[PDB]
C-alpha cells in the first residue's frame, strides 16, 4: 500500500495506491506504420529517457493564486531529455505528470490540476503581442495573479480567466484531477501526444500546459507551518525522434 | 633491484606466482676488547610484514611482537629458514609494466604506487647479548613458484 516505483536505474518515488487519469482515454504509445509522413525511422531512446524528473517544490501559501508550466519546455535542462531536445529535429512524447502535496490533517484547501492542450495565451496589453520570456520559464513555475496585470509584452495573468479568456471553472473540460486536502493527497495525469502533425519540433511548439489553481484557499491556525509544498514529477513516455544533427538552436 | 632477474621477469607484462624465500644466515665474532668468549647459540627472528602491516622503526620495537606479522625463530647450526608467501594482491596478477598513474587525476608518480606490493622482510637477533658483538650476514634466495 506504500508501493515504490522505480523507473530507470536512477529514480525512486514512494506513493500509495490512488486514482489516475488517463488522457483523453488513450495510453501513450509508439508510432505505427500508417501514421507518419517522415522519410526515416524513429530510433526511440527508450533505454535512457524514461525516468522521473522531480522539479523544484512550490510553496502553496495562503495568498497564492496559481501556477503554470508549459511543456515540453519544462524539461529543457532536465538531463538527457533536454539533450534530445537539442540534438534532434522532430520529437513526440507522452508524459505522466504526478502531483502531490504534503499537508497535515489540520490544513485545508483544494487544488485543480489541469493539462490544457494548446493553451495559447493572450497578452496583458491589447493591440500587442507576447514574448517567449513571459510565456514560461525553463524549469520554474509562472504565477497567476489575483489582480490585473498591466505590462506591455506580458501575459494577462489574472486568475479567473486562466490566461486564455475563459471561465476558470470550465477548465474541468480538459484532463484534470482535484487535490482536496481533506481526502485526497496526490494527483497523477497521463497525457498522450496531441498534435495535428505526427511529429513537431519541440522548441517552437508548446504541446500542453499544466495548470495548478487553488479554488478553496489554504487555511491553517497559528501552530501550523504556513505553506504546503506541492511537488510535481514528470516522467516522459514513449519518446521518439528524427533528424540527428548538432544543437542548431540554443 | 637485481638486473639479471629483472630482465627475465620483463619478458612478460602480467605475472602471477607464489614466493619461496630462503635465508642463509652466517654470523661471526667481532674483534676488539670485551670478547664474546662463551657464546651460547644465536637465535634470529625473521618477520614478514604483510603489505600494509606494522613496520619496525628500529630494534626492540612492538612491531616485532605484533601477532599480525608472521615471524620465524631460527637457531644457528641447522638447516636454513624457509617460508612461502601466496599471491597477495587485490588485483588478479602482478604487472611488470604500468602505463598509467597512481591517482585518478593522472597525478603522482608514473607507475610506482601500483598494487604490486609484496611486503617487507625484517631480521634481527633475539638474544640480549651484552659482552661481545656478533655480526651476522643474511642472504635472501628468492624463488617464484607456480
Amino acid at each position: 500500500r506504500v508501493r515504490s516505483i522505480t523507473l530507470g536505474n536512477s529514480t525512486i518515488t514512494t506513493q500509495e495506491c490512488a486514482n489516475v487519469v488517463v488522457g483523453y482515454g488513450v495510453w501513450p504509445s509508439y508510432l505505427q506504420d500508417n501514421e507518419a509522413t517522415a522519410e526515416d525511422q524513429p530510433t526511440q531512446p527508450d533505454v535512457a529517457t524514461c525516468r522521473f524528473y522531480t522539479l523544484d517544490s512550490i510553496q502553496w501559501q495562503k495568498e497564492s493564486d496559481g501556477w503554470w508550466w508549459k511543456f515540453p519546455e519544462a524539461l529543457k535542462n532536465m538531463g538527457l531529455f533536454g539533450q534530445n531536445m537539442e540534438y534532434h529535429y522532430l520529437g513526440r512524447s507522452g508524459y505522466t505528470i504526478h502531483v502531490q502535496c504534503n499537508a497535515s490533517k489540520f490544513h485545508q484547501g483544494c487544488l485543480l490540476v489541469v493539462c490544457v492542450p494548446e493553451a495559447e495565451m493572450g497578452c496583458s496589453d491589447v493591440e500587442r503581442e507576447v514574448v517567449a520570456a513571459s510565456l514560461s520559464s525553463e524549469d520554474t513555475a509562472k504565477s497567476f495573479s489575483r489582480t490585473e496585470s498591466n505590462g506591455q509584452h506580458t501575459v494577462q495573468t489574472v486568475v479567473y480567466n486562466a490566461g486564455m479568456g475563459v471561465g476558470v471553472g470550465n477548465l474541468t473540460i480538459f484532463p484534470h484531477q482535484w487535490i482536496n486536502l481533506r481526502t485526497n493527497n496526490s494527483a497523477t495525469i497521463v497525457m498522450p501526444y496531441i498534435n495535428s502533425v505526427p511529429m513537431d519540433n519541440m522548441f517552437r511548439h508548446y504541446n500542453f500546459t499544466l495548470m495548478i489553481i487553488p479554488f478553496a484557499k489554504l487555511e491553517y491556525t497559528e501552530q501550523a507551518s504556513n505553506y504546503v509544498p506541492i511537488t510535481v514529477t514528470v516522467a516522459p513516455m514513449c519518446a521518439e525522434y528524427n533528424g540527428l544533427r548538432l544543437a542548431s538552436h540554443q | 633491484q637485481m638486473v639479471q632477474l629483472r630482465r627475465k621477469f620483463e619478458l612478460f607484462t602480467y605475472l602471477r606466482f607464489d614466493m619461496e624465500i630462503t635465508f642463509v644466515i652466517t654470523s661471526t665474532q667481532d674483534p676488539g676488547t670485551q670478547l664474546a668468549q662463551d657464546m651460547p647459540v644465536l637465535t634470529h627472528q625473521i618477520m614478514y610484514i604483510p603489505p600494509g602491516g606494522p613496520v619496525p622503526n628500529s630494534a626492540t620495537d612492538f612491531a616485532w611482537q605484533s601477532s599480525t606479522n608472521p615471524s620465524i625463530f631460527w637457531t644457528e647450526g641447522c638447516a636454513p629458514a624457509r617460508m612461502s608467501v601466496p599471491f597477495i594482491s587485490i588485483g588478479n596478477a602482478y604487472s611488470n609494466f604500468y602505463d598509467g598513474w597512481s591517482h585518478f587525476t593522472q597525478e603522482g608518480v608514473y607507475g610506482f604506487n601500483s598494487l604490486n606490493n609484496m611486503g617487507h622482510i625484517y631480521v634481527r637477533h633475539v638474544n640480549e647479548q651484552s659482552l661481545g658483538v656478533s655480526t651476522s650476514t643474511l642472504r635472501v634466495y628468492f624463488k617464484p613458484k607456480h
Partner: antibody
Amino acid sequence: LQQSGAELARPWASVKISCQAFYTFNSYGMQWVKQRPGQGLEWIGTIYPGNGQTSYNQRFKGKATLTADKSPSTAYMQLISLTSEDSAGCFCAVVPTVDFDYWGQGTLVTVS
Amino acid sequence: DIVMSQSPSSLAVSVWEKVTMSCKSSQSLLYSNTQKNYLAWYQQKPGQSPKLLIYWASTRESGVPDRFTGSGSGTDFTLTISSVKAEDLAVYYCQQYYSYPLTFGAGTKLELKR
C-alpha cells in the same frame, strides 16, 4: 561586474584572468575580448554555461583556454606562451543571445 | 565558499627592507594526488591590469625577481619580498585554484614611504 587586478607576467609563460558575474550563469555565455590600442577590438572566445559549450576564434585556438565552474560562479581565461604581442587589455562581457551588453574594466596584461 | 584572508591589508615600507605578507585560506588548498598547493599570487600595478607572480604557490614567472617568492603550504602562505625596489608599490591579491567560486584575497596594498 569585476576583473583581475593589474599583474606583471614573464614571456613564454601563462596568465590566468578572472571575471566575476553577479547574474546567474544560465541561458547565456561569457564573452572574452582583447583590445589593441593601435587597432580595434578582437574576440577571443565565449564559454556558454547554459548549455556548457566552450569555443574560441581560430586565431586563439591553442592560445586561450576558457573555463567556468558552478559554485564559484567566476569565469576564467588562461593564455600561454606569452609574448609582447599579448600585452593588451582583456575584457569579459555577457551575452543573453539578445546583445553583447556591457564589458567593464580589466587588468592591462603587461608582458615584461 | 572558500574565503581568502590577507594580513596586513596594507603596509607602508621604505627602500631596502625585507617585507612579507600572509594569505591564509579558510580551507587547505592542498590536495593529496600531486601535493601541489592551489594558490596564485598577483601584482596589480597602480592603475594597471594585474600580472602573475607565483603559480602553484611555489614557482616563479619570467621577468620576475627573487624578491617575489611563494612560500607555505596547507592553509597559510606568504610572499617573501627580499630586497624591495621602486616597482613594488602596488596592490597584491592572492587567489586559489581549488573551489570553483574562484574568490581572490582581501588585497595587500604595499605602500611606498618616502
